[PDB]
Every structure is written in C-alpha cells, then in structure tokens.
Write a protein that binds this ligand. Structure first.
Ligand code: HEM
Ligand SMILES: O=C(NC[C@](O)(Cn1cncn1)c1ccc(F)cc1F)c1ccc(-c2ccc(OC(F)(F)F)cc2)cc1
Ligand SMILES: CCCCCCCCCCCCO[C@@H]1O[C@H](CO)[C@@H](O[C@H]2O[C@H](CO)[C@@H](O)[C@H](O)[C@H]2O)[C@H](O)[C@H]1O
Length: 527
C-alpha cells in the first residue's frame, strides 16, 4: 500500500510548483483553469438532469461576446443544435434560456419562491433610481409600488394627458432646432436625438407635472442627461467605479430626487395636493398594506425609476416607428387617411377616446413592438431548484433563467414573414395586448393568468409592465401629430438600421437620419 509514498510526492510536487520561474507560474495560472474549464464542460455534458450547456473557450467570460452582439442570432443557432432549453455562461453567471411560449410560462409565471427578479436587477437599477424602490426592496413592496403608480394611469388620467402631450409635441415642432416648423418646411433629423427629447418633454409634462416640465427648460436638463448615461448594462458588472461617469450619475440622482422632494414638501406645506400628476397621486396614495408609508425620498426615487424606464422603452419605440415608416409611404398614406376620417379632416380635436378609434395607428405601434421589443432578454435569479416539466432537467439555485419574448416575435412559425413590417397582420386585433382567459392579481390589478402568448411586448406575471396604456397614449398622440403634420423619407441609399443589443433597450444603431417635410408648408404653430 504505497499511497504513503504517493502522498509524499504530492507534497513534493506542491513544493516544486513554487520553485518554477514566475513566467511558468503565470502560464500555469492561465492554462490550468482553461483546461479544467474544458474538462468540466465535457463532464457536465454527461448530465441528463441539466439542459445542454453552450460550449465556450474563455472561462468566466463564456459566450458573452456573441450573446451581446447578436443575442437573437445566438439564440437561433443554439435552438437549432440543442432545442428550446439550453444554458450558457455569461461573465461568471450561468444563464438558462427557455425559448418560445413554454419558456414564457416557465419564467414569467414561475413561483415567487423559485425565482427573484430583484436579485438579477438590483445592481442594474438601484444606483440610478436610488434606494428603497423597484428592485431595492422585497417583492411585496414592488407590487404595491406598481399599484400606487397605476393610480395615476386611469382612463380619466389619459383623457387629461392627451392635450398635454399634444401641446408638448407641437411646442417641440415649433421650438426645437431639429424642426422649427414656423421657419423651415423641410429638414434632416437624427431620430435618436429628437425622440429621447420628445419623450422626456411629453412624459415629464403629463406624469411629473408642469413644475418638473418647466425645469427641463433650464440647466437642470443636464442632470437628466447625466442620470440617463448612468442607465446602462455596464451596471450589471460595474455598478460603482470611482470614475467621473459614476459620480456625475450619483450627483444627478441626488439633485433630481432633491428637486422632486422639494416640490413634494412644498405641496404638502401649502396643502396643495390635487389630481394633476403622478406626484399628487403618490402623495395621496403611498401607504403599504402593513401601514408603513413611503418616504419622500422613496417617492422621488420611484418617480425617477418610472420616468427612466418609460423613457428608454418609449423613445426607442417611436424612433423605430419613424424609421420603418420612412421607407413606407404607403403606411404613412394609410395612417393619414385614418387621421382625416377619425378627426373629420382635422376639425376635431384629438382626445383619448378618438385615439381608440384609430386602429391602424395602434396596429403600427403594435407591429413596431413586435419587430423591436425594447428588452431582448429578461432575467430572474433562480432561488430554489426548478424541475423543467416534461423533461429530466433541473435548474439549480444560483443559476439564472432568461426569457426572450422578443425572440419569438421574430419567428416565422408564429408571425409569418416575421422580418417584414406589416401593420395589417393585426387587422381586427389592434389591442395593445389581450388577456385571452382567466386573470390574477399580484397586488397591482387583475392581469392575464396565462403568459403563453407568442406576443408579449409587456412581459407577464407578477413583473408585468403597468405602463402599457401610458405608452400607447403617448406614442399614439405623438404619431397622430407626426402623421398629420409631416411626411418623411430616407436620404438616398439609407434604410432601417439594425438594433443595438448592448444598450439598455434595443435602440437603432446611429446616426439614424430621416428627412421630413411639412404636409402644409404654410401651417403655423401659435404661442
Ligand atoms: C412600449 C413601451 C414599453 C414596453 C415594451 C415595456 C415593457 C416592459 C416589460 C417587458 C416589462 C417586464 C420586465 C421583466 O419581466 O423583467 C416591464 C415592466 C415594467 N414596466 Fe414597462 N414597458 C414600456 C413602457 C413603460 C412605461 C411607459 C412605464 C411607466 C410609465 C413602464 C413601467 C414598468 C414597470 C413599473 C414595470 C414593472 C417591473 C417589475 O415588476 O419588475 N413601462 N415593462
Ligand atoms: O431596465 C431594465 N429592466 C427594468 C425595467 O423593467 C425596464 N422597463 C420596463 N418597462 C419600462 N422600463 C423597469 C421596470 C420598472 C421601472 F420602474 C423601471 C425600469 F427600468 C433592463 C434593462 C436592460 C436589460 C438588458 C439585458 C441584457 C442585455 O444584453 C447584454 F447583456 F447587454 F448583452 C442588455 C440589456 C434588461 C433589463
Ligand atoms: C351631468 C354632468 C355630471 C356628470 C359627472 C361627470 C363627472 C366628471 C368627472 C370625471 C372624473 C375624472 O376626474 C378626475 O380626473 C383625474 C385626472 O385629471 C383623475 O386623477 C387620476 O390621475 C391623476 C393624474 O395622474 C392623479 O394625480 C390622480 O391620483 C388619479 O386619480 C381622477 O381620478 C378623476 O376623478
């Protein structure tokens, strides 16, 4: 039994390792994890209680590069080889993807005990929004925060928002250097300049109120830019680095939330709390069901998060709407005729109810969100082992699950000719979304119990979006006015750009320029 002499040579070998020249040591510090990673994958591949794991060369990094550049093309290749459930390594994390409607069910309807959104997202959002809200709090708090925000998102609220949003659009056409319709009949714009600007102007005026919109006409607007630059997927890896980008971000968060808090405290002092905006609403309705009240700081931080999330999804979407219509004068013409019919040649004022009578306009939004889901991947951290039904698979705690309704939006099996933009695929189905059957309430209102729809621009289950009707209201007013006021087209040789999958939303790669011209060159915008 010469295991003793073998154990002596183990200790001897461990000693001889340290006497290697330093280059051989570093070389061994690199070659040994690499070889072990390959060996580990080969062994892992033997497992039958695990989904197939995408092979990768660089330890820790995994498939990060190819996933980040072209996630849908990555998914399609993986789907061909391995089917609908497969894992990949992403910067030290194991991501289990479940494609298609069954994956929507597996992730969006997973048990609260099994998965955690806030554990996946906290580092992404908390340094931008501030503490105590959205993902920096337990799920039950998030549920009620969504309930609070929904209280300012009623039909009656949208009826008041429409003329406010319309006013802001017309003001932008009049005053922005990108347009100046009283002085120019044609111009060239970068839609990733105009649309983020129009989106924050319209959303601040309606959700935040006249005071906070007024602020955007000052140097305070630079704080919003500074905060917007902090809203980036780099926060997943580097939420805080001692650089200037980060300190500009933190400073802006303090100053913007400070501005909101100043208005909040001034309103309470003056007893000036009406039903004007989301701030009024949160001042009157922000008590959790255990009787704890949101602080003024948490109210402000929630306002930041709502406005920032709504900012990126909606600005990206109206950019894509403009870009797809720039090569589709037929759609512009069809939309214009609908406007003339619904609004009696323009003699009728746009109202929230009339927006509902504009199916083609709404189908255009719907179809843009099919082809351009602003969020290509949604994440949950796995908290308890999950059995994948009808498989032998178990997804262990410490893994992440990734769901991608945006991938299914682009599958021919569910949307024939899925890479053609065609608003008429939605004829007699112009609703922003539809609960086909039974409903459930997680704390913010009854929503569809099933999430099997191949079309889920707004997600589903407890984390489902509550801004869908605001987004359609905002996008609808904005596009109604764009269509009635302008025609637009591409400069020669340009077409729809491909998306940027490394940004917070799948926005178009730039510079994405269109040329506009006034339908009525003599139309003037008053005020
Ligand atoms: C076209 C516009 C929009 C799209 C496509 C969209 C999409 C989504 C999606 C897919 C989710 C689910 C996220 C997940 O499961 O991880 C979500 C959540 C949410 N969205 Fe939106 N959104 C849009 C606009 C807005 C707007 C305008 C607001 C606010 C006014 C908003 C506020 C929220 C909130 C509060 C949540 C809940 C997050 C959670 O429960 O974890 N969204 N949105
Ligand atoms: O903002 C994100 N998720 C919060 C969000 O739901 C966004 N949102 C939804 N509705 C409106 N905004 C949210 C909810 C409530 C709020 F109040 C504020 C919010 F903001 C998100 C952003 C980027 C990625 C992402 C993932 C992978 C990726 O690819 C990679 F890794 F870079 F390669 C790129 C981006 C995922 C989620
Ligand atoms: C015969 C004539 C008389 C018939 C009666 C007609 C009643 C008309 C009143 C309709 C009610 C709408 O009036 C009021 O609108 C505001 C929006 O401005 C809604 O307000 C809602 O949105 C605002 C703004 O986001 C939030 O601040 C607020 O917390 C929320 O409740 C009120 O909830 C609603 O009560």
């Amino acid at each position: 039994s010469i295991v003793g002499e073998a154990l002596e040579y183990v200790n001897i070998g461990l000693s001889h390792f340290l006497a290697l020249p330093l280059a051989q040591r570093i070389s061994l510090i690199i070659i040994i994890p690499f070889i072990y990673n390959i060996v580990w994958q080969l062994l892992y591949s033997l497992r039958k209680d695990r989904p197939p794991l995408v092979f990768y060369w660089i330890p820790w990094v995994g498939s990060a590069v190819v996933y980040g550049m072209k996630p849908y093309e990555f998914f399609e290749e993986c789907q061909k080889k391995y089917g609908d459930i497969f894992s990949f390594v992403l910067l030290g994390r194991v991501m289990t993807v479940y494609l298609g409607p069954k994956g929507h069910e597996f992730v969006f309807n997973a048990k609260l005990a099994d998965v955690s959104a806030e554990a996946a997202y906290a580092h992404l959002t908390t340094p931008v929004f501030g503490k105590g809200v959205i993902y920096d709090c337990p799920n039950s708090r998030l549920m009620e925060q969504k309930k609070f925000v929904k209280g300012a998102l009623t039909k009656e609220a949208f009826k008041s928002y429409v003329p406010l949003i319309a006013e802001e659009v017309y003001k932008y056409f009049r005053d922005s250097k990108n347009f100046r319709l009283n002085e120019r009949t044609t111009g060239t714009i970068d839609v990733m300049v105009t649309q983020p600007e129009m989106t924050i102007f319209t959303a601040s005026r309606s959700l935040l109120g006249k005071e906070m919109r007024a602020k955007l006409d000052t140097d305070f607007a630079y704080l919003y830019s500074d905060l917007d630059k902090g809203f980036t997927p780099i926060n997943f890896v580097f939420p805080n680095l001692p650089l200037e980008h980060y300190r500009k971000r933190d400073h802006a968060q303090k100053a913007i939330s400070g501005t909101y808090m100043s208005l909040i405290k001034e309103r309470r002092k003056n007893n000036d709390i009406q039903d004007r905006d989301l701030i009024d609403s949160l001042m009157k309705n922000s008590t959790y069901k255990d009787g704890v009240k949101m602080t003024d700081q948490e109210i402000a931080n929630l306002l930041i998060g709502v406005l920032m999330g709504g900012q990126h999804t909606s600005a990206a979407t109206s950019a894509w709407i403009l870009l797809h219509l720039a090569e589709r004068p037929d759609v512009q013409q069809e939309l214009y005729e609908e406007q003339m019919r619904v609004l009696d040649g323009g003699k009728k004022e746009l109202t929230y109810d009339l927006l509902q009578e504009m199916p083609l306009l709404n189908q255009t939004i719907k179809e843009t969100l099919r082809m351009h889901h602003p969020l290509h991947s949604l994440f949950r951290k796995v908290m308890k082992d999950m059995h994948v039904p009808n498989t032998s698979y178990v997804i262990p705690a410490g893994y992440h699950v990734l769901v991608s309704p945006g991938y299914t939006h682009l599958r021919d099996e569910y949307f024939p000719n899925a890479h053609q933009f065609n608003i008429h695929r939605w004829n007699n189905d112009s609703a922003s979304s539809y609960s086909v059957g039974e409903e459930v309430d997680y704390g913010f209102g009854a929503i569809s119990k099933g999430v099997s729809s191949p079309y889920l621009p707004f997600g589903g289950g407890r984390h489902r979006c509550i801004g869908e009707h605001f987004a359609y209201c905002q996008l609808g007013v904005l596009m109604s006015i764009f269509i009635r006021t302008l025609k637009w087209h591409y400069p020669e040789g340009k077409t729809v750009p491909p998306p940027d999958f490394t940004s917070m939303v799948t926005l178009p790669t730039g510079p994405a320029k269109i040329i506009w011209e006034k339908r009525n060159p003599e139309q003037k915008i008053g005020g």
